[PDB]
Amino acid sequence: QGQFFREIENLKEYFNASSPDVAKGGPLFSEILKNWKDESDKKIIQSQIVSFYFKLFENLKDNQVIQRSMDIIKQDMFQKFLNGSSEKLEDFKKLIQIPVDDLQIQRKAINELIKVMNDLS
Amino acid sequence: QFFREIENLKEYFNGGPLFSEILKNWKDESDKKIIQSQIVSFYFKLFENLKDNQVIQRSMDIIKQDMFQKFLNGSSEKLEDFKKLIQIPVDDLQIQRKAINELIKVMNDLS
Known part of the structure; x- marks a missing residue:
């Protein structure tokens, strides 16, 4: 494991993700992740969350001081979600x-x- | 009527494959949902892009309903979370x- 611990903490710092105001507004993902807690179809919901962070982090490449942090977390999301499987990460990306x-x-x-449509059927 | 509606869209709208090629490479029918979740949501955003063309709005709605039925197993709850x-x-x-x-x-749910 490693560096994601410290980098998640750096992002919370930068954005003030720990202040009480963030708390009250309602949960974003966490709540949804609990309702699909016992699934195989959970990958559907997780694929949306992972790509959100991807797109979110890209939306923040202008904030240079945190860019290194975002890359470290992004790498972990990949290696975890796609089991570090190259190609599967290219198609997804x-x-x-x-x-x-x-x-x-x-x-x-x-x-x-x-x-x-026939792939779904 | 999804197939005729797909045919209706082709009428209205008249290099390198987009999805098809990717859909063939994901042979592990298990983590394939990851890739399919992206495609489905793509069409969702697209159909909503083209929501101005009233002549095809009926067609898009019919296909959209099928996607939900065939992907989210007609689960009204799972659809809201997704939407x-x-x-x-x-x-x-x-x-x-x-x-x-x-x-x-x-991160903990992904590990």
């Missing part, structure tokens, strides 16, 4: 980066709608 | 603070 508003992608996505 | 998670805004400071605060609980 490649899907969460696909932009909704790109016209070429919009047309492409729509074209592949049957191929995706 | 809210994808709506959570990254740029909201309150949320940024909250998310960061819960980083251990989430």
Whole structure:
């Protein structure tokens, strides 16, 4: 394990994630994670959370002083969630980066709608 | 009517594969849900992007309902959690603070 302990603490510092005000506003993920506590379909909900942090941390690369911290935590999320499986991390990283508003992608996505729909069925 | 609606969208809208190729590589049908959760939410955001085209709004709704039925097993609860998670805004400071605060609980659920 290691460095994620100290880095999670650094982020709480920087954002003041420990003040009483944060507490009262309602839980974000934790509550949801408890309702799916006993599942196989839990991966669905966890995939959304993991990508949130991914996108959140990217939204904060401008805050240079914490950037090193975010990278260390992000690495742990990966190695844990995708069991350090290379490729599986590339596909995942490649899907969460696909932009909704790109016209070429919009047309492409729509074209592949049957191929995706049959994968679900 | 999902298939005809898929066909209706192709009518309305008339290089390198996007999802299809990725869906073939994830052979471990177990952690495949990870990748499929991303795709499903993508279409959710897309259909909502295209919510202005009234002529296809019916079509998108029908397919959207199928996705829910076939992915979340028609579970109205599981759908809300999912529909809210994808709506959570990254740029909201309150949320940024909250998310960061819960980083251990989430990290603990992943281990």
